[PDB]
């Protein structure tokens, strides 16, 4: 029932390159962009072979430098693992020029209430945002 049970994201964590994830991907970025439910790939050439993911709900990804930059800004949804770069989505604003992006359907849920899946702040606080492509 308490805040301690809320999941927090892993957007800032990095896993070592010991599982050959980059090699199986051809050293191409594994990011998936979501724009109002339309999914698209990246496959840009990667520079670092360490892997990342916003939560353990999804598999680890090797990423291009642009998508690693967006991942550490909490622009990837921990619920589904898709990046929120354009279209409509929710943003939690814990501090100046900090935005945690996520889909309305991907909020954390505890005791019937909804929370930011990055940081655990109440999601009724979350603003709806529309960003052009
Ligand atoms: Zn990429
Ligand atoms: Zn995050
Ligand atoms: Zn999502
Ligand atoms: Zn948050």
UniProtKB/Swiss-Prot annotation:
It comes from the Eukaryota. Expressed in all tissues examined, with high levels in fetal liver, thymus, lymph node, spleen and peripheral blood leukocytes and lower level in bone marrow. Disulfide bonds: none annotated. It is found in: Nucleus; Chromosome. The SET domain mediates interaction with WIZ. The ANK repeats bind H3K9me1 and H3K9me2. Belongs to the class V-like SAM-binding methyltransferase superfamily. Histone-lysine methyltransferase family. Suvar3-9 subfamily. Heterodimer; heterodimerizes with EHMT1/GLP. Interacts with GFI1B and WIZ. Part of the E2F6.com-1 complex in G0 phase composed of E2F6, MGA, MAX, TFDP1, CBX3, BAT8, EHMT1, RING1, RNF2, MBLR, L3MBTL2 and YAF2. Part of a complex composed of TRIM28, HDAC1, HDAC2 and EHMT2. Interacts with UHRF1. Interacts with CDYL. Interacts with REST only in the presence of CDYL. Part of a complex containing at least CDYL, REST, WIZ, SETB1, EHMT1 and EHMT2. Interacts with PRDM9 and CDYL; interaction only takes place when PRDM9 is bound to hotspot DNA. Interacts with SMYD5. Histone methyltransferase that specifically mono- and dimethylates 'Lys-9' of histone H3 (H3K9me1 and H3K9me2, respectively) in euchromatin. H3K9me represents a specific tag for epigenetic transcriptional repression by recruiting HP1 proteins to methylated histones. Also mediates monomethylation of 'Lys-56' of histone H3 (H3K56me1) in G1 phase, leading to promote interaction between histone H3 and PCNA and regulating DNA replication. Also weakly methylates 'Lys-27' of histone H3 (H3K27me). This is Histone-lysine N-methyltransferase EHMT2. It comes from Homo sapiens. The chain holds residues 419 to 550 of 1210 of the full protein.
């Amino acid at each position: 029932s308490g805040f301690e049970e809320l999941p927090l994201c892993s957007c800032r964590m990095e896993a070592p390159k010991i599982d050959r994830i980059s090699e199986r991907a051809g050293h191409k970025c594994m990011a998936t962009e979501s724009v109002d439910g339309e999914l698209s790939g990246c496959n840009a050439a990667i520079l670092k072979r360490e892997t990342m993911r916003p939560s353990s709900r999804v598999a680890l990804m090797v990423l291009c430098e642009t998508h690693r930059a967006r991942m550490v800004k909490h622009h990837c949804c921990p619920g589904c693992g898709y990046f929120c770069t354009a279209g409509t989505f929710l943003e939690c604003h814990p501090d100046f020029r900090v935005a945690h992006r996520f889909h309305k359907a991907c909020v954390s849920q505890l005791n019937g209430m909804v929370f930011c899946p990055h940081c655990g702040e109440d999601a009724s606080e979350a603003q709806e945002v529309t960003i052009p492509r």
